[PDB]
Amino acid sequence: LPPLGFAIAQLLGIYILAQAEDSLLLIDMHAAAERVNYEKMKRQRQENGNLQSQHLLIPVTFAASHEECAALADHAETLAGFGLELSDMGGNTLAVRAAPVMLGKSDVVSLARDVLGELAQVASHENRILATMSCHGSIRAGRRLTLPEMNALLRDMENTPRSNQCNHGRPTWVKLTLKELDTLFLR
Amino acid sequence: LPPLGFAIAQLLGIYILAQAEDSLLLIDMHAAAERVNYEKMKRQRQENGNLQSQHLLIPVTFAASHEECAALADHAETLAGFGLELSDMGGNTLAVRAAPVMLGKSDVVSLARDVLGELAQVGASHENRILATMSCHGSIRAGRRLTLPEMNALLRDMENTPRSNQCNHGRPTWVKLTLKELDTLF
Amino acid sequence: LVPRGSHMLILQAERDSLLKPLQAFTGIVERLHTLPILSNVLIEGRGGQTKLLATDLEIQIDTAGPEGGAGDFRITTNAKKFQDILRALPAGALVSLDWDDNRLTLKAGKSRFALQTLPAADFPMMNVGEDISATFSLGQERFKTMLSQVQYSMAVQDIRYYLNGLLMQVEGSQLRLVATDGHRLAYAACAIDADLPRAEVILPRKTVLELFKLLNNPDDPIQIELLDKQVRFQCNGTTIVSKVIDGKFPDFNRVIPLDNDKIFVLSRAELLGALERVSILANEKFRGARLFLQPGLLSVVCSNNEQEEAREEIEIAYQGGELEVGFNIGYLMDVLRNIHSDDMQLAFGDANRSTLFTVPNNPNFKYIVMPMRI
Amino acid sequence: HMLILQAERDSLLKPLQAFTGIVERLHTLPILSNVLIEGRGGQTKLLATDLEIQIDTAGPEGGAGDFRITTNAKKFQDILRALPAGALVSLDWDDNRLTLKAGKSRFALQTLPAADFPMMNVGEDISATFSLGQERFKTMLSQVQYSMAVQDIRYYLNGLLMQVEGSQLRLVATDGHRLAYAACAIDADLPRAEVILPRKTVLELFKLLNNPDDPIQIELLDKQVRFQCNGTTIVSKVIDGKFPDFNRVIPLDNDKIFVLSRAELLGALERVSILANEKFRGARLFLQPGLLSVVCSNNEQEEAREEIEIAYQGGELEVGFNIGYLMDVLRNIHSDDMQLAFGDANRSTLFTVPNNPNFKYIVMPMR
Amino acid sequence: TLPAADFPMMNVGEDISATFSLGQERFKTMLSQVQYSMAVQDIRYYLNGLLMQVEGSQLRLVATDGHRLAYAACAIDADLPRAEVILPRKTVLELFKLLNNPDDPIQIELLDKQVRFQCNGTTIVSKVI
Question: Which domains does chain B have, with CATH numbers?
Answer without folding.
Answer: 1-50+142-186 (3.30.1540.20), 51-141 (3.30.1370.100)
